[PDB]
Structure formats: C-alpha cells, structure tokens
Design a protein around this ligand. Structure first.
Ligand SMILES: O=c1c(-c2ccc(O)cc2)coc2cc(O)cc(O)c12
Ligand SMILES: O=c1c(-c2ccc(O)cc2)coc2cc(O)cc(O)c12
Ligand SMILES: [Cl-]
Ligand SMILES: [Cl-]
Ligand SMILES: [Cl-]
Ligand code: NA
Ligand code: NA
Ligand code: NA
Lengths: 10, 241, 244, 11
C-alpha cells in the first residue's frame, strides 16, 4: 500500500 | 461541476489553494557535506509533498478522478511541481535558489553535492527566464495545475479510464481559457496573448527536463547510499524507475 | 533580418519544403530478433537520419544566421526529441505500432525484446494515439519540430556578450513567429479563437512529453553504451556525450 | 571545432 495512495484518502 | 467554473473562479481557486512555504531542517552549526545537503533537500521535499497532496485535492476536478489516476498524475509530476515552486520562490533573488527561507543557496553551495551544480545552473537559468517574462502569480498557479494534469496524462482501456482522461483534457482546456482571460484582462493584445501562452507553456518543457535530471541524480545518490529516503520518496522515485 | 520578416504562409511553406526523406532500416526477417539486433537497427537508423536532420535544420528560418557554436548547441539539445517526434508522426496511421521506417514497424511485444524498451514504446505509442485524437496536421507537426530545435537548448544558451544576447533575442523572436504561424494555420482552418488557443496549448504540451521521452531514451542509450550492447557510431557517441 | 557535428554543419 503506497504512502501516496494513503495520503490521498485522508 | 469543476468543468462549469468560470476563468475567474479557476484562478481564484488556485490562488487560495497555494501551499505554505516550509523551512528546511538546516542547523548552521553543521557544515554542508554532500550527505547533509542531500538530507536537507530530501527532507524538505518529503514535508512539502504532504502539502502538495492537500493542494492537488483543491485543483478543480482532481478529486473526481479515481485514486489510481490521482496517484499516477502525482507520481509523474511531483518533482516538476517542487521545482517550479522553487524557481518561483527564487525570482526575487537573482543568482540564488530559495529552497526555503533558511536555505537560500548559490551555485557554489550546490557544488557540495556531486552532480548538483549542473542542476542548480539549469534552475538558475529558469529563474532568469521567469524574471525576463515578468511571470505573474496567476500565471504560475495555472502552470502548476497544468503540470499536475498533463505530465502523466498520455500514459493512461476501460470506459471509466476514457472518462477520466476526457475529464482531464477538458480541465486542461479550461485552464488554457483562464490563462488567456488573465492575459486579456491584463491588457495584452490578441497576438500578445497567443505569443505569451506559448512562451509560458514552453517553460514546461524545461521544467520536465530538470525534473528528469533531478530524478536521475536522486537515483544516483540513493544507489551510492548517500542519503536515506523516506518510504514516500522511495516510492515516488520508484515510479520513475 | 529577412528570416524575421517572413509571413506565416512563408514560414509554413518553408518548413514543409524542408521535410527530410523517410529512410529504410536494415531489417531482415531471417535474423534472430535479439536485443542486440533490434538496438543495432534503431541506432543505425538514427545515425543515418542525423545527417538529414542537419540539412533540415539549416532550412529552418534564421537557423544559419546563428553562430556555428549556437547551431551545435541547439542540435545537441534537441536531436533525440526531433527523431522521436518524427517517429510519432510516422506512427499516427498505424495504431499500436511504431513506424521507425517503412520496413520496420514494431509493436510493444517486439519492444519487449530489449530490456527497458517496452516502457519507452508505451510512451511513444500513447503519444501517437494523442496525435490521432487531435487529428494533428502536417503543418502543425512541422511547426512543432522547428519549435523543438529553437527551444530545447535556449535557456542554457549563453548571452555573455552583446552579440550572443542579440542572437538569443533573435531565437525568441523566431519562436514567437512560429507561434504566429501555428495560430494562422488554425485560424485558416476555421477554428474559433477559443478553439485556437486551446489547440495551441494542446500542441505545446506535447513537447513536454517529447522532452520526457528523449530524456528516457538518452538514459537508455547510455545504458546500452555502458553495457556494450551494440557498437555506436562516432557521431552518436558525440551526441550522447553532449548530454553528459 | 573538432566535433563531427561542427564539421557537418559547415559541409
Ligand atoms: O531539487 C531537488 C529537491 C527539491 C527540494 C525542495 C524543493 O522545493 C524543490 C526541489 C529535492 O531533492 C533533490 C534531490 C536530488 O538528488 C536532486 C535535486 O535537484 C533535488
Ligand atoms: O528511439 C530510439 C531511436 C530512434 C531511431 C530512429 C528514430 O526515427 C527515432 C528514434 C534510436 O535509438 C534508440 C536507442 C535507445 O537506447 C533507446 C531509444 O528509444 C532509441
Ligand atoms: Cl514543516
Ligand atoms: Cl537577412
Ligand atoms: Cl506488459
Ligand atoms: Na508540515
Ligand atoms: Na491570438
Ligand atoms: Na527469414
């Protein structure tokens, strides 16, 4: 799970 | 909805979304070794990336795309966006690069890192171009939004994807409309509008070049164990490998 | 100067007349299609095209008015971008394929024969699809190629003397004239003002992608050189070396 | 002056 993908959610 | 905004609304939205200007971690009790300078620049990029994601979510229409398209566009554009912001911040400081307010560097300081002075020289030349053109903040924010939407847009066959791609192209056209409107409001003649539109968009060829050279350099630094990189930067860099 | 006084029609006509020939590759179906064989075909073709590119550049309005050092600088910056935009143009009529030459039409599965090449193929193919989407016209293509030649190296172009400053300003004036020519062509074709400005931007954004693919191709070519995958001509080695 | 490209641009 990419950090960037995570940050685009919150 | 995003595609129904007027030119004034688009520029206003982009101006309001501008990210904060962060400080580097620079401790002036320590000298600028290659490793320390690389650590300062990459740590700054890491912290700026969080704010870049907030900014991207405020670019009209961006959050209407799938998360895969948002990831891909940011993976393609991130260093271009950092670098165009750097050049903008440096306009008022001929001969220097304002990485942060506490990290204003000249080309000789760039020699602290092998291969970096060549990149500094290109960024400094681009800052001179911004000054020559009297680049305005309204034009700068349009260019940054264009980079975000354009840099990754050709490497995009389902229906949903074609839909997302069409949305991006329609928004790129709306930003063109906004740039022309700003130039017309500012008093430029019709010929001056198309000539300046082209001058501005050609900036993006040079920004792309500098991002590619910076990405190659960052990979080289990583491959030589010069600097540890965050998981985010490792993944951002791996998107280009 | 005479070149800086040309009309839009004169600029477009001059660029159409300067178009280089389309050369053939050495492709032989009987040869094992190894990484080394494919890369030999591509580098051999690029070498032969470079000679014709020099003749073409000398016909771009104003180019021969610059110093020899200026001309070398601009070609060293732009050469692979110019080859690649020509490749994309030739490939427009062939969805899913890259027309390196009339006898060398390669798909992405053939590109997989070379390490690191399919990624480059995918970018070039996507750019060809964009050309198709836009219905790019030959008059627009030739203006873009001239813009690459004059723009790619112009930020690093030295202006440390009055004469070199003058030449740098001449390049920027000619870039403006080529923009004028593109707009004139699109107006004559019936586009509204809004459509003209939108299309000008769409066309110039292509050049960001061309730059990207050139940089990726140059890194790949350097890797091939370092790994001794294929022999490169003296000219290619010198052009490659001008990119560090 | 000894670059191949320099020679081709003259010839
Ligand atoms: O320019 C940068 C930056 C950078 C940092 C902050 C900015 O706002 C802009 C660029 C970061 O890491 C690098 C790392 C490199 O190896 C080379 C570079 O040129 C850079
Ligand atoms: O694309 C090319 C071409 C090429 C050849 C002819 C053209 O008209 C365009 C590109 C040449 O050598 C390469 C060599 C490489 O290592 C990678 C490449 O992508 C290329
Ligand atoms: Cl912070
Ligand atoms: Cl003359
Ligand atoms: Cl695949
Ligand atoms: Na922060
Ligand atoms: Na116009
Ligand atoms: Na055979």
């Amino acid at each position: 799970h990419k950090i960037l993908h995570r940050l685009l959610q919150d | 909805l995003a595609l129904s905004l007027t030119a004034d609304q688009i520029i206003s939205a982009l101006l309001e979304a501008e990210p904060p200007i962060l400080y580097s971690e620079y401790d002036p009790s320590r000298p600028f070794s290659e490793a320390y300078m690389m650590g300062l620049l990459t740590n700054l990029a890491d912290r700026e990336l969080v704010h870049m994601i907030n900014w991207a979510k405020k670019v009209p229409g961006f959050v209407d795309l799938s998360l895969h398209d948002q990831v891909h566009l940011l993976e393609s554009a991130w260093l271009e966006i950092l670098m165009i912001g750097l050049v903008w911040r440096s306009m008022d400081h001929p001969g220097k690069l304002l990485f942060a307010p506490d990290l204003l560097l000249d080309r000789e300081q760039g020699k602290s890192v092998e291969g970096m002075v060549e990149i500094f020289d290109m960024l400094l030349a681009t800052s001179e171009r911004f000054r020559e053109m009297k680049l305005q903040r309204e034009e700068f924010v349009c260019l940054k939004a264009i980079i975000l939407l354009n840099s990754g847009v050709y490497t995009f066959s389902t229906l949903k994807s074609l839909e997302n791609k069409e949305k991006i192209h329609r928004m790129l056209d709306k930003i063109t409309d906004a740039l022309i409107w700003y130039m017309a409001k500012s008093g430029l003649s019709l010929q001056q509008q198309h000539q300046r539109l082209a001058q501005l968009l050609l900036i993006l060829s040079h920004i792309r070049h500098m991002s590619n050279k910076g990405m190659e350099h960052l990979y080289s630094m990583k491959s030589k164990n010069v600097v540890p990189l965050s998981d985010l930067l490792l993944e951002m860099l791996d998107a280009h490998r």
